[PDB]
Design a protein around this nucleic acid. Structure first.
Ligand SMILES: [Mg+2]
Ligand SMILES: [Mg+2]
Ligand SMILES: [Mg+2]
Ligand SMILES: [Mg+2]
Ligand SMILES: [Mg+2]
Ligand SMILES: [Mg+2]
Ligand SMILES: [Mg+2]
Ligand SMILES: [Mg+2]
Ligand SMILES: [Mg+2]
Ligand SMILES: [Mg+2]
Ligand SMILES: [Mg+2]
Ligand SMILES: [Mg+2]
Ligand SMILES: [Mg+2]
Ligand SMILES: [Mg+2]
Ligand SMILES: [Mg+2]
Ligand SMILES: [Mg+2]
Ligand SMILES: [Mg+2]
Ligand SMILES: [Mg+2]
Ligand SMILES: [Mg+2]
Ligand SMILES: [Mg+2]
Ligand SMILES: [Mg+2]
Ligand SMILES: [Mg+2]
Ligand SMILES: [Mg+2]
Ligand SMILES: [Mg+2]
Lengths: 230, 54, 52, 65, 251
RNA sequence: GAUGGGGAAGCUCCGUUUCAAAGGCCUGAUUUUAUGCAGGCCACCAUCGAAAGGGAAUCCGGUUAAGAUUCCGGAACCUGG
RNA sequence: GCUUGUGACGGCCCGUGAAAAUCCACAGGAAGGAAUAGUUUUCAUGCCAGGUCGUACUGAUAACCGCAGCAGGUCUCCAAG
RNA sequence: UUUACUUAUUCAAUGAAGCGGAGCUGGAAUUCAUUUUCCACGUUCUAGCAUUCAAGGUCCCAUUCGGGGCUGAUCCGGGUU
């Protein structure tokens, strides 16, 4: 004990060599990281028109969880199941000679963009889910107005990757329910009530507001001090 | 200088083959007197502060 | 919580170090290796027989 | 602001011209009266310019251990 | 004609600067946290001669504040500094000859040299021997300081630009005559290939606008326009006056 | 004078550390046991450019038709292991 | 005495008269360590190895260039009475 | 014409190191009812020294010659200035 002696350092401004600190605020990142961050910044700095700014009003967490539970109840057929269905129905039609008889009517979600855009305008679709992050946004900027004109419930949901995991792809960017079996019609009606309360009834008000004028921290503090001086 | 023993390149003193012994004793006296002036500074700063405390 | 915010004492970003595989071909490069291009009979040719 | 460029350039040229005239007057005044003075005056002015051109440690205690 | 000599000087083949014996570029220390908020102390180790330059140079060594290391800077020597002297640099430095201060920290009438034009370019104004800048006023709002330059002109600088207190050593250098073509030779030998100079009136019309004719003359006036086209600009370039600036020939 | 970049219809031009994710030492730990990470580094950016500049270390005697500070005889020194 | 090497000085400059590889030393105190031992190959002795290319002769009133075995031209060291 | 805004465009530097806002602790202040305010926020007789995740102070340890945390060194925003 008494052979050890305390000797506090003077990290000063001209006294000792500075210690190692967390300099993660001043890292010279690679150019791809810099372009990602500045692309997001420049997208939020500018004035955004209402037809693109109707996105980033996504669905809430509990409603998203209940919606994905309902849609996970109707997952499409996978490859091994398809192959063994082909084996079993081939064996059955080898003996009895009947097509579309051993296999019943299948229920699944619909997921391609051309297919779903054609299920609207025929008004067979009962729910449409649209991803909020399609990288060319021109593929989906017309789907709210189309669903509104054709009278289909739609919801803008977070994750083309989440829709892809729902439908056994990597990304899918749309999803649709056309028919429910027998026992999920009540849950589907409650869900489309909660969905139409959030998306389709607010359309004629959302289509008139621009949105996006947000400053950074230093400019916001400067404007606050200037208005407090004012 | 790589082909000889260390006795040919060194003098038995601190900073032996590097400084002068005049430059060495000047460094010693400077170090001792500067540290004593720092002690004097701390003492007189304490005296000013304990005077201004009242 | 947020995700993962590493602490960086350096302002420099270097390229990270990834696993370099070794080469493992599907066919041989030459398929017959050469013999000794300089053996003893190729090295020593003949004696020199003059006065010196 | 269409006058500010021409007025700043005009003021800057007048200030530069005053400085030029001042330094020219000073250098001519140096060169004359020096090139126009004989060896007698030269040697005299050279000779003239060659002529006229609490121990603190006390506040420290002693016999300290 | 052919390409004339002042046109030829811009390709930079035999007209580049002779930089072998030069000690390094002379500039101030890089602005950082210590100079921005407090001060830092270095020591001048040697005062040396620089080839092709009238003013001497000073080697001031400082410490690295983030690494155990020493850093040596090349200053231009102000008149009065000596080896073994401490140099203080930063916002809270004292008003002594040799110290580096911002222009917002000096009072009126102060004599500074090696002054930054923008804050952080490490020295632009009054760098030749015997020259200085005079502070002639401030502006606490708008953060500006008014200065007088060695040519007589007035300028307005940001108050965050730095400068060294004093006048630059080596004054009175041009008060001595050279007397000799060999002295002029050895002077320009360590600067650049620009001496001796042939007069343009002594050439042929292929070589210069002033060449040709019996009885060596310039045929027209020697004042050129500002919008001439770079083979024509030989003479007095955009002159607002001619004459003597003295008006008397004798003082 | 390449590369990274940027010009030019193009042959090619600029530039030499640049507005680039630009590369090594080893301690590891040592025991699929051999060497993946090592846990600390890493500021410099290729390369070419002097048989008069810089530069590790050799002398004497003999010897041939013609070679020698190189061969032979004797006596040294330097680098690496 | 002559030629040459070297030392300590002195004069001159608005002229103050290269760089890098490379080698050594110092500060520092990491780490290992003496008792049956660790450090030393910076003390002495002993052992092994040192690759590639050039190397003859002229260097000029005949070996180089001027159409030539051309009174021309073409860098340097030694230096007896 | 004048004047604002910053994200386009433009300029400059760096080792992309300490930016912006809010604090603590003093001081002046000086309360017109209080912190509406503002300055300060470890180094200046001397050609010394300043480097090993930092000593100390608390906690867990797997306590082995030890190994990890906080604090020492105020929070927040990831806009390098
Ligand atoms: Mg000795
Ligand atoms: Mg050059
Ligand atoms: Mg002349
Ligand atoms: Mg003529
Ligand atoms: Mg003629
Ligand atoms: Mg002409
Ligand atoms: Mg003429
Ligand atoms: Mg006439
Ligand atoms: Mg090139
Ligand atoms: Mg080479
Ligand atoms: Mg050589
Ligand atoms: Mg040399
Ligand atoms: Mg011979
Ligand atoms: Mg031999
Ligand atoms: Mg000689
Ligand atoms: Mg030595
Ligand atoms: Mg030979
Ligand atoms: Mg020979
Ligand atoms: Mg010969
Ligand atoms: Mg000869
Ligand atoms: Mg001869
Ligand atoms: Mg001849
Ligand atoms: Mg011939
Ligand atoms: Mg001849």
């Amino acid at each position: 004990n008494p052979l050890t002696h305390s000797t506090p350092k003077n990290f000063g401004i001209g006294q000792a060599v500075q210690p190692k600190r967390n300099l993660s605020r001043y890292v010279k990142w690679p150019e791809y990281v810099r372009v990602q961050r500045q692309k997001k910044i420049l997208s939020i700095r500018l004035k955004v028109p209402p037809t693109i700014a109707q996105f980033q009003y996504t669905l809430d967490r509990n409603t998203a969880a209940e919606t994905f539970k309902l849609f996970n109840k109707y997952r499409p057929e996978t490859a091994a199941e398809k192959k063994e269905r082909l084996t079993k129905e081939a064996a059955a039609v080898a003996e009895g000679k009947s097509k579309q008889d051993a296999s019943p009517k299948p229920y699944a979600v619909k997921y391609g963009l051309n297919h779903v855009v054609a299920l609207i305008e025929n008004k067979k679709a009962k729910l449409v889910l649209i991803a909020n992050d399609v990288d060319p946004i021109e593929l989906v900027v017309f789907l709210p107005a189309l669903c509104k004109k054709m009278g289909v419930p739609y919801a803008i949901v977070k994750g083309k990757a989440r829709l892809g995991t729902l439908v056994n792809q990597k990304t899918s960017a749309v999803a649709a329910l056309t028919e429910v079996r027998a026992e999920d019609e009540a849950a589907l009606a409650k869900l489309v009530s909660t969905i139409d309360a959030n998306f389709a009834d607010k359309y004629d008000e959302v289509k008139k507001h621009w949105g996006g004028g947000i400053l950074g921290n230093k400019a916001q503090a400067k404007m606050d001090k200037r208005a407090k001086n004012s | 200088y790589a082909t000889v023993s260390k006795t040919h390149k060194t003098v038995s003193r601190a900073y032996g083959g590097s400084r002068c012994a005049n430059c060495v004793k000047e460094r010693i006296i400077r170090a001792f007197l500067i540290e004593e002036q720092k002690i004097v500074k701390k003492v007189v700063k304490e005296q000013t502060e304990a005077a201004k405390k009242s | 919580g947020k995700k993962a915010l590493k602490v960086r004492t350096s302002a420099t970003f270097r390229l990270p170090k990834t696993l370099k595989l070794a080469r493992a071909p599907k066919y041989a490069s030459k398929a017959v290796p050469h013999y000794n291009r300089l053996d003893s009979y190729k090295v020593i040719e003949q004696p020199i027989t003059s006065e010196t | 602001s269409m006058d500010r460029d021409r007025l700043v350039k005009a003021l800057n040229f007048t200030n530069r011209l005053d400085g030029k005239i001042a330094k020219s007057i000073s250098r001519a005044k140096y060169i004359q009266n020096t090139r126009k003075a004989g060896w007698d005056s030269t040697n005299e002015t050279i000779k003239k310019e060659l002529a006229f051109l609490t121990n603190r440690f006390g506040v420290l205690p002693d016999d300290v251990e | 004609g052919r390409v004339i000599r002042n046109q030829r000087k811009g390709a930079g083949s035999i007209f580049t600067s002779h930089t072998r014996l030069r000690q390094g570029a002379a500039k101030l220390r890089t602005l950082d946290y210590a100079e921005r908020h407090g001060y830092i102390r270095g020591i001048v180790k040697q005062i040396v001669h620089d080839s092709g330059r009238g003013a001497p140079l000073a080697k001031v060594v400082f410490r690295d504040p983030y690494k155990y290391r020493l850093r040596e800077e090349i200053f231009i020597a102000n008149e009065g500094v000596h080896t073994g002297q401490f140099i203080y640099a930063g916002k809270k430095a004292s008003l002594n000859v040799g110290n580096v201060l911002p222009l917002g920290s000096v009072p009126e009438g102060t004599i500074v040299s090696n002054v930054e034009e923008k804050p952080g370019d490490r020295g632009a104004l009054a760098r030749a021997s015997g020259n200085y800048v005079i502070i002639i006023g401030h502006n606490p709002d708008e953060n500006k300081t008014r200065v007088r330059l060695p040519s007589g002109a007035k300028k307005v600088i940001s108050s965050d630009a730095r400068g060294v207190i004093g006048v630059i050593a080596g004054g009175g250098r041009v008060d001595k005559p050279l007397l000799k073509a060999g002295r002029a030779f050895h002077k320009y030998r360590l600067k650049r290939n620009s001496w001796p100079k042939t007069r343009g009136v002594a050439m042929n019309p292929v070589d210069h606008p002033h060449g040709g004719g019996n009885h060596q003359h310039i045929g027209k006036a020697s004042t050129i326009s500002r919008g001439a086209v770079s083979g024509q600009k030989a003479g007095l370039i955009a002159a607002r006056r001619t004459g003597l600036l003295r008006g008397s020939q004798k003082t």
